[PDB]
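Renewal narrative, Specific Aim 1. Our central claim is that a sequence can be written position by position from structural information alone. The example that follows is taken directly from our test logs and has not been curated for this report. It begins with the structure tokens describing the chain, in the order in which they were read.
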């Protein structure tokens, strides 16, 4: 079986937010059938970033989602060739992030390449002023459509001030081969930033994700 109980990944991310270009490299590890993983990220070009790390954190791994045996695990089944995903996050204040991502399995390790584009964040808003404080737990509504797997969710970012800053998120996950699509279900996800240096040029994260019937 190509996906072992323990799997590492390597990751390259590039992109721009509000005109600022960056690159990040990461390495992570986790237990795909348990839905858990951690990663060490570092900003390798464009640091320090003048925006909140938190808009980048959900772009850093859906092979690590626990599934019950009766929900086909389309994204695990796609390996070793892998899958691609594309996402839009529409933030409440008009900011937008679009993502394209490629996922493959090479010599026992997952390989991620991510391209992130964000724009129209207000300069006095919480993203450009770095006033965010991590994501509340999300529930992604998963469903087959057009021969792909889609996910929808409202994600909420905590704010330094006590409130929240929300995004509507839409993602399309497309396996490189037509492995078995599931029926509709939900995935419970919680992502934590477990360590960072002051300017977030060195960051660690943890995520747990588990699918269940809806």
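The sequence written for that structure reads:
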């Amino acid at each position: 079986e190509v996906i072992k109980e323990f799997m590492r990944f390597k990751q390259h991310m590039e992109g721009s937010v509000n005109g600022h270009e960056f690159e990040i490299e990461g390495e992570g590890e986790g237990r795909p059938y348990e839905g858990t993983q951690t990663a060490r990220l570092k900003v390798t070009k464009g640091g320090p970033l003048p925006f909140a790390w938190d808009i980048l954190s959900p772009q850093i791994s859906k092979a690590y989602v626990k599934h019950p045996a009766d929900i086909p695990d389309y994204l695990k089944l796609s390996f070793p060739e892998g899958f691609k995903w594309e996402r839009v996050m529409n933030f409440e204040d008009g900011g937008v992030v679009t993502v394209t991502q490629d996922s493959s399995l090479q010599d026992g390790e997952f390989i991620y390449k991510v391209k992130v584009r964000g724009t129209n964040f207000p300069s006095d808003g919480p993203v450009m002023q770095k006033k965010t404080m991590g994501w509340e737990a999300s529930s992604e509504r998963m469903y087959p459509e057009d021969g792909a797997l889609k996910g929808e969710m409202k994600m909420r970012l905590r704010l330094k001030d006590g409130g929240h800053y929300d995004a509507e998120v839409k993602t399309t996950y497309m396996a490189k081969k037509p492995v078995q699509l599931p029926g509709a279900y939900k995935t419970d996800i919680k992502l934590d930033i477990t360590s960072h240096n002051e300017d977030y040029t060195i960051v660690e994260q943890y995520e747990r994700a588990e699918g269940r019937h809806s």
